[PDB]
Design a protein around this ligand. Structure first.
Ligand SMILES: *[C@@H]1O[C@H](CO)[C@@H](O[C@@H]2O[C@H](CO)[C@@H](O[C@@H]3O[C@H](CO)[C@@H](O)[C@H](O[C@H]4O[C@H](CO)[C@@H](O)[C@H](O)[C@@H]4O)[C@@H]3O)[C@H](O)[C@H]2NC(C)=O)[C@H](O)[C@H]1NC(C)=O
Ligand SMILES: *[C@@H]1O[C@H](CO)[C@@H](O[C@@H]2O[C@H](CO)[C@@H](O[C@@H]3O[C@H](CO)[C@@H](O)[C@H](O[C@H]4O[C@H](CO)[C@@H](O)[C@H](O)[C@@H]4O)[C@@H]3O)[C@H](O)[C@H]2NC(C)=O)[C@H](O)[C@H]1NC(C)=O
Ligand SMILES: *[C@@H]1O[C@H](CO)[C@@H](O[C@@H]2O[C@H](CO)[C@@H](O[C@@H]3O[C@H](CO)[C@@H](O)[C@H](O[C@H]4O[C@H](CO)[C@@H](O)[C@H](O)[C@@H]4O)[C@@H]3O)[C@H](O)[C@H]2NC(C)=O)[C@H](O)[C@H]1NC(C)=O
Ligand SMILES: CC(=O)Nc1ccc2oc(-c3ccnc(C(=O)N4CCN([C@H](c5ccccc5)c5nnn(C)n5)CC4)c3)nc2c1
Ligand SMILES: CC(=O)Nc1ccc2oc(-c3ccnc(C(=O)N4CCN([C@H](c5ccccc5)c5nnn(C)n5)CC4)c3)nc2c1
Ligand SMILES: CC(=O)Nc1ccc2oc(-c3ccnc(C(=O)N4CCN([C@H](c5ccccc5)c5nnn(C)n5)CC4)c3)nc2c1
Ligand SMILES: *[C@@H]1O[C@H](CO)[C@@H](O[C@@H]2O[C@H](CO)[C@@H](O[C@@H]3O[C@H](CO)[C@@H](O)[C@H](O)[C@@H]3O)[C@H](O)[C@H]2NC(C)=O)[C@H](O)[C@H]1NC(C)=O
Ligand SMILES: *[C@@H]1O[C@H](CO)[C@@H](O[C@@H]2O[C@H](CO)[C@@H](O[C@@H]3O[C@H](CO)[C@@H](O)[C@H](O)[C@@H]3O)[C@H](O)[C@H]2NC(C)=O)[C@H](O)[C@H]1NC(C)=O
Ligand SMILES: *[C@@H]1O[C@H](CO)[C@@H](O[C@@H]2O[C@H](CO)[C@@H](O[C@@H]3O[C@H](CO)[C@@H](O)[C@H](O)[C@@H]3O)[C@H](O)[C@H]2NC(C)=O)[C@H](O)[C@H]1NC(C)=O
Ligand SMILES: *[C@@H]1O[C@H](CO)[C@@H](O[C@@H]2O[C@H](CO)[C@@H](O)[C@H](O)[C@H]2NC(C)=O)[C@H](O)[C@H]1NC(C)=O
Ligand SMILES: *[C@@H]1O[C@H](CO)[C@@H](O[C@@H]2O[C@H](CO)[C@@H](O)[C@H](O)[C@H]2NC(C)=O)[C@H](O)[C@H]1NC(C)=O
Ligand SMILES: *[C@@H]1O[C@H](CO)[C@@H](O[C@@H]2O[C@H](CO)[C@@H](O)[C@H](O)[C@H]2NC(C)=O)[C@H](O)[C@H]1NC(C)=O
Ligand SMILES: *[C@@H]1O[C@H](CO)[C@@H](O[C@@H]2O[C@H](CO)[C@@H](O)[C@H](O)[C@H]2NC(C)=O)[C@H](O)[C@H]1NC(C)=O
Ligand SMILES: *[C@@H]1O[C@H](CO)[C@@H](O[C@@H]2O[C@H](CO)[C@@H](O)[C@H](O)[C@H]2NC(C)=O)[C@H](O)[C@H]1NC(C)=O
Ligand SMILES: *[C@@H]1O[C@H](CO)[C@@H](O)[C@H](O)[C@H]1NC(C)=O
Ligand SMILES: *[C@@H]1O[C@H](CO)[C@@H](O)[C@H](O)[C@H]1NC(C)=O
Ligand SMILES: *[C@@H]1O[C@H](CO)[C@@H](O)[C@H](O)[C@H]1NC(C)=O
Lengths: 171, 322, 322, 171, 322, 171
């Protein structure tokens, strides 16, 4: 991936998360669980919806276009008509296939960027109150109940509220 | 206590192609390529088409006796002709500018059929009962229902000179023919003259036909020919026919009403009580996708034809599960 | 003490479309789509065009009496013809290959007008004063200024056979006509013969015209017709006219000088003392942008026509102020 | 944004900076002020100028092309001429609109990358002599007059010259 | 102890263009634009072409005496004609639908030459020895080898009426001519008649030619003309010639075998003992690249022609060494 | 560069590395040397190979297409044939040149991303057992023989095996 998140420092995907694309996985004293981040996932849905919509909108409706007949003394004009039809078909085929290739790549890159940015958000929230174990997880240096977990999810984590505890546990 | 950031996975076998990697298994995708059709000729926005059956465009527009079923149709969304029709010009000859007439009729949404020169009010000094075994119907000799083969009456073929003014406020399609007998005996025997002429003139159309007598190969048990001719008459113009023989006079004419979206297609698909917004020779398309690989010939509001076999666009992620 | 890293913002209302989001307000942008024009016909790089006025291409090139203002023009950057001209073929008839002649004249930058068969030195045994009320000028009967209606002189129409060699080092456009009277009385009354002929032959052009006498509808108070014909004469070739009647002889010819960038357009925009590098039927375009939605018909060095209403490319940032 | 800077960890833009795209904002004992980084801004101007120039250059001058006339027996050829003209117009319209869409997106992504890279440059200069407060700002652990600020701007910051002071202030 | 992460560099001078920067020196690149050719006409997949030499398509297909070297060739991959050939229609005249015949022959892979009307078994009452000094060979008068100039025999030109049935299971190309003498003395002196006719009829082809006698400019020391005509005969159809004079009868015919990938090109490049999959008028192309700027006219399996001077795609990095 | 690595915090390239695109440079007691990382380089080779292959594959073989002749009364049809040929040539020229431009840019961006991701991998391996000197190098806080260097290269570095040594040397 371009941004090193998907198939990068985060090695695999979670089949257990079934309500979104990018999400979390918390495990505290009250238990564990998966939960999809709705803001980032919704932004991706809006952007990709607008992308596919733009692709369809730039393909205007093809109206009536039928073949033509030519008598035995109009072979040049028949071959010119065929050349026109075949040429336009070739160009539109090339356009469609190439567009789908390139924008497929850019879509996967877009998801990779969304995951990288989400990870950087959570990291920028936690700061040194947790250590960065591999695979894109954070090991907390303090207690974090469901209140604190949901505080991290919606981007409202309180750093000074645990600086004493984390500085003590870091020994 | 730990929190992790990760991404979705599933059992999806959807694959797409990318610029760096082919056959990438993804979690969610949307196909943009329509490949399905119903294999039937359907109505276009409720309006039914015109099936010609075993009749060609020439046979349909000239009034071939085996095409009487097509006379009652005066409005359609498009025209279906079998790939190679059976009943066309039953009396052999050359149809002048046949393809141009096809192209003209491709933009016609409806017309009014009316006998421009009624068969029993126009030629009191001529015979209007000429028939041929090459244009037979129910085993007996017959002739086109939109033309009138003027032959000899009481042993004379007087100088005829008729005309028609466009009292219809639309374009009027006029068709006629010119007979070319095989030998001189049938020529004099049919038109009582040795050097005849046909003359058709309008405000901007003007042509004069001379019969060419020669020995020609048999086509449908006939050595003589009939060259077919047609013209469009603008609203308000007057067309003048002057002839002393060898004129296949016009009987019925057509007042044309133009319309976009119609056309002539070759198809063997059967008609059915279906309605669609998109029709192809392979069948009707019911889709909102931007591309289709069904057929390049389209009628109505169709997707854009491409030669591709697969156009799948990824919406989800690279599926990396377990 | 603190230092920050940030980005620009302003009160810009510029919006562009992106693949992920429509109507994105940006700080700076450049429009790539020209939609403005001056609504006037201008000079192309200083060279003025040829306004035909109420005259068609046929009327201009045949010397219609109401088009004498157009004779002095022998060089232009392009040709403007009114959408439906008024003064064309004043004497009715068919102009053979009219559209091909238009296409030929579309690549002409200038020509030399000269009387190839001077009216008072060529036909000493024929009359050169034939005029018609259908081609009237100042209320009185007249005729084309580039053609010569040869009629009867002292009661005879001798066999004329003239020719011309191309002494101009350029292509020479030659025009002529063939008269078709309504009845035999005017035929014999005008050309003293019953079966006339016209014959025009060059090194590679060869055609023979026979008058067709028939009753035709009135067009501008005329039942007879005049079929118009033309040909291009290569440098060094000789054209031969042989006739004994019904020949509308050539009077003036044109030595053609080819040139690219010219053309024939239909426009109602007025001429003005403006100069531009790009001209459209809607008006002149003064722009350096790569696209335009003004008109697809262009002359000179123009932007590429597109059907778009807006093509704005972002140069700045997403405008996120306050 | 793809790189999480614009509309990312830096939330908004500065109307007070009127001389460039990407810039700074310093506040020391001598006062505060905005100032645009001229190297990054100039690089963006060069790249975008070359992009628009390339777009215009690939659109070669359209020379004279007028309509054609056809008589009453040339309807097939008239419709073929129309099919050609309309087809080329459709293809060029599609090309222009699609190009503008995609390269607009890539231009905004380009700016986002420039901001992210500038922030990473300043961070790589300061190291642990300042702490990373949110919104893309740095809180200095030492004294920084206009000399030091301008040393950070032009990318010539001296790390050991303040390591003692910053290590003392970090307590 | 230290470890570093870096990237490759070299002495490469390869430059590519990017959207943000022109003339970027890169480490590795691949050129996608073929600009080289061998400047020779080569075989296409082993099959050699048909070099016409100083002969045109008309001269080759009519049997011009200076083109006897081309009779032995009955199979080719494509056809090469010199830009302006020398030996075409040696006896002047108009070749009807010449360009359409060229287009027909462009899709021909081989044919069978056979004398349809053997010169000494078909016209026992006519002379088959007519020659002209305008079609000379080895200094002496001669004539086309695929046509037969029927002249007077023992002072009479009887009514001839021959025909041919298609016993070849393929399309049969038939060619003939119509003679137009300059004056009446040579007309009666050659065909013993004053009002002759030629009539060619098939199942769907039918035309009648009348000689036009007029004074025409000299072309290759000839005032008379010969209008050339041709037709395609479907498998199973019968063609009928009826004439009493002025018929340049057919001698040899061609049974056509269709084939794709062939064509007619104008080139001055010499033939050589080379084989290629792609041939252009400039020369043969031996490449697997997707683009070429050599020539737009291609035969075989060629790269797509573009007007570009450079299409280099970067594979490596931006070369930033030392 | 979009990802700030190539021509970014890593200023230049190494002519001394001749076996790959992205690589290393180690200097320990046993000596120094260059060595290309084969996994990342091979991934780049595969992706770019598939890109060029896709470009060639979308350009289908141009088969026989020759000019046509027209007599003196077919100037409109001759000019229509020319309009068709010239139009298709213009469109294919535009497609080729524009495609090469844009995908050249995206290829250089791809390399920049590969270098950035490799650096982030090595950093995520070393953690605080080495300090981040500029120019994309790491200064080890402990001893690292060829065994340890090759452990860093193939992505199998052992963090706890040197935490005591590095924590002592960090004083
Ligand atoms: C002509 O084309 C139209 C347009 O595609 C087509 O109508 C479509 O049919 C499909 C399938 O019948 C519809 O898709 C469904 O939509 C409904 C409402 O949105 C959903 O409830 C369905 O979702 C799931 O539901 C099931 C469980 O409840 C699942 O088991 C099932 O697999 C579905 O995944 C389903 O997606 C679609 O809405 C219509 N579209 C329109 C505009 O009506 C039509 O069938 C075609 N043929 C004809 C003869 O018209
Ligand atoms: C035909 O097209 C040409 C080309 O576009 C066009 O000429 C252009 O006119 C504009 C507007 O008159 C010029 O733009 C100006 O450029 C000058 C010099 O670069 C600047 O000083 C101006 O900048 C600002 O100045 C004012 C304050 O001093 C601002 O209040 C004002 O709003 C401006 O933002 C201004 O941008 C442009 O330079 C010319 N281009 C050329 C090549 O001369 C011409 O008007 C069109 N019409 C005709 C009949 O020729
Ligand atoms: C027609 O086109 C074909 C296809 O391009 C062309 O054949 C090619 O010729 C080149 C050059 O002769 C071949 O490239 C070589 O490939 C071999 C085997 O892969 C390599 O050993 C060579 O590599 C290097 O070797 C030398 C040192 O040992 C270097 O000094 C040298 O500079 C090389 O870099 C070399 O790359 C290519 O393999 C063939 N292609 C095929 C399919 O055979 C042919 O020449 C053209 N002309 C004709 C008349 O056929
Ligand atoms: C004619 C035609 O087909 N037109 C058309 C136009 C625009 C479109 O846009 C889309 C489209 C966009 C973006 N995404 C998905 C998509 O595939 N989704 C599936 C996954 N789904 C996830 C999702 C992720 C993981 C498991 C389950 C759902 C989600 N997250 N949250 N919600 C509410 N849904 C989002 C939408 C689909 N399809 C489109 C189709
Ligand atoms: C026919 C035609 O229009 N051709 C054409 C060709 C190439 C172009 O390239 C550009 C173009 C490039 C890059 N940027 C800006 C642009 O919009 N700018 C406005 C902002 N301006 C900022 C800027 C930023 C914020 C406030 C004020 C200025 C700046 N920074 N420094 N300077 C000296 N200027 C840079 C240029 C504009 N316009 C172009 C137009
Ligand atoms: C008709 C036609 O030309 N078709 C075609 C199709 C697909 C192609 O894909 C490529 C292609 C891809 C990716 N890379 C390189 C390339 O330029 N390389 C040169 C550098 N080389 C480096 C390399 C890097 C630095 C020094 C030396 C080699 C390397 N690394 N490891 N190996 C084994 N090789 C990789 C390949 C080249 N060329 C292609 C050509
Ligand atoms: C991938 O996994 C999904 C499940 O997450 C599979 O979708 C499910 O497929 C089963 C059949 O294999 C469907 O079962 C049906 O359920 C309905 C309603 O309960 C019942 O009435 C039927 O009789 C049948 O048992 C199930 O509905 C369906 N799930 C959904 C949400 O539609 C999917 O098939 C798997 N893919 C593959 C390739 O196996
Ligand atoms: C967005 O803000 C800018 C200012 O940063 C506005 O541009 C300015 O608009 C005012 C009028 O609204 C211009 O005032 C004029 O100034 C000249 C010279 O001082 C004076 O002679 C005139 O009489 C008039 O007062 C001002 O010049 C202009 N600034 C520039 C640099 O051109 C802009 O209008 C704002 N946008 C919107 C949509 O309001
Ligand atoms: C950039 O540097 C490379 C070297 O890394 C240059 O490639 C080398 O060029 C020399 C000649 O300048 C070649 O020398 C030849 O070597 C063969 C075999 O040893 C020998 O038989 C010949 O007589 C000749 O001396 C050398 O082979 C070649 N290297 C390779 C791998 O092909 C390259 O020329 C330099 N670029 C420029 C623009 O100077
Ligand atoms: C309409 O078409 C049918 C065939 O579809 C014609 O029937 C053929 O008539 C010819 C007469 O020469 C016979 O030789 C064939 O054997 C008949 N075939 C069949 C299948 O019946 C019919 O004559 C046509 N009628 C008209 C008026 O064109
Ligand atoms: C694009 O967004 C702008 C604002 O971000 C829209 O401008 C406003 O449009 C609403 C209509 O919904 C008006 O009531 C406001 O007065 C507009 N604002 C101003 C300052 O005039 C704009 O309409 C949007 N464009 C589209 C196509 O929706
Ligand atoms: C040139 O055009 C004008 C009209 O633009 C012609 O004037 C008309 O002449 C006809 C003669 O039959 C009259 O019936 C009309 O009433 C006239 N209309 C007007 C507005 O004057 C004029 O005759 C044309 N002259 C030539 C030589 O073509
Ligand atoms: C692209 O850049 C290269 C160097 O980076 C240019 O090569 C030099 O061009 C100058 C001309 O301005 C010559 O004086 C030098 O001798 C060239 N260098 C070498 C090694 O030959 C090259 O000209 C640039 N290309 C363009 C189109 O400007
Ligand atoms: C074949 O072409 C050659 C020239 O390539 C002809 O030779 C010319 O014949 C004419 C006869 O009128 C002479 O005036 C020229 O001087 C000759 N030129 C040369 C170079 O010889 C030859 O006559 C042609 N033969 C046929 C049968 O067409
Ligand atoms: C039309 O042709 C079909 C052959 O499929 C035949 O069954 C049918 O009877 C024909 N109808 C008429 C009216 O000729
Ligand atoms: C041309 O037509 C206009 C009508 O707009 C008229 O005013 C003018 O007098 C006419 N001029 C000539 C010379 O016919
Ligand atoms: C063909 O023309 C060339 C002129 O290049 C001449 O040398 C050669 O003798 C000619 N051959 C024939 C058969 O006319």
């Amino acid at each position: 991936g371009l941004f090193g998140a998907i198939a990068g420092f985060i090695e695999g995907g979670w089949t257990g998360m079934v309500d979104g694309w990018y999400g979390y996985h918390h495990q505290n004293e009250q238990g564990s669980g998966y939960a999809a981040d709705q803001k980032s996932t919704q932004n991706a849905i809006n952007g990709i919806t607008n992308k596919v919509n733009s692709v369809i909108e730039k393909m205007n409706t093809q109206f009536t276009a039928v073949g033509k007949e030519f008598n035995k003394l109009e072979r040049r004009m028949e071959n010119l008509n065929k050349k026109v039809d075949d040429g336009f078909i070739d160009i539109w085929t090339y356009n469609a296939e190439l567009l789908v290739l390139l924008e497929n790549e850019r879509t996967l890159d877009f998801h990779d960027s969304n995951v990288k940015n989400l990870y950087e958000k959570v990291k920028s929230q936690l700061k040194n109150n947790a250590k960065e174990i591999g695979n894109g997880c954070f090991e907390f240096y303090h207690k974090c109940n469901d209140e604190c977990m949901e505080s991290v999810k919606n981007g409202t984590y309180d750093y000074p509220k645990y600086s004493e505890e984390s500085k003590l546990n870091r020994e | 206590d730990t929190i992790c950031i990760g991404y979705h996975a599933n059992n999806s076998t959807d694959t797409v192609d990318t610029v760096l990697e082919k056959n990438v298994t993804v979690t969610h995708s949307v196909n943009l390529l329509e490949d399905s059709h119903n294999g039937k000729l359907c109505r276009l926005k409720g309006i039914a088409p015109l099936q010609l059956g075993n009749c060609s465009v020439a046979g349909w527009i000239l009034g071939n006796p085996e095409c009487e079923l097509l006379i009652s149709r005066e409005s359609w969304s498009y025209i279906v002709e079998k790939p190679n029709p059976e009943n066309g010009t039953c009396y052999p000859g050359h149809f002048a500018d046949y393809e141009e007439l096809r192209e003209q009729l491709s933009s016609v949404s409806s017309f009014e059929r009316f006998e421009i020169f009624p068969k029993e009010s126009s030629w009191p000094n001529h015979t209007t009962t000429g028939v041929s075994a090459s244009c037979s119907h129910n085993g007996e000799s017959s002739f086109y229902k939109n033309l009138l083969w003027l032959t000899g009456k009481n042993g004379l073929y007087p100088n005829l000179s008729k005309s028609y003014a466009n009292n219809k406020e639309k374009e009027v399609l006029v068709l006629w023919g010119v007979h070319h007998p095989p030998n001189i005996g049938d020529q004099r025997a049919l038109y009582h003259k040795e050097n005849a002429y046909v003359s058709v003139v309008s405000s901007h159309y003007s042509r004069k036909f001379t019969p060419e007598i020669a020995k020609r190969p048999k086509v449908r048990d006939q050595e003589g020919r009939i060259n077919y001719y047609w013209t469009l008459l603008e609203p308000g113009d007057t067309i003048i026919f002057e002839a002393n023989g060898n004129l296949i006079a016009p009987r019925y004419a057509f007042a044309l009403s133009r319309g976009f979206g119609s056309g002539i297609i070759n198809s063997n698909a059967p008609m059915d009580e279906c309605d669609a917004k998109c029709q192809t020779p392979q069948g009707a398309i019911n889709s909102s996708l931007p591309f289709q690989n069904v057929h390049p010939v389209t009628i109505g509001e169709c997707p854009k034809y491409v030669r591709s076999a697969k156009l799948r666009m990824v919406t989800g992620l690279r599926n990396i599960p377990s």
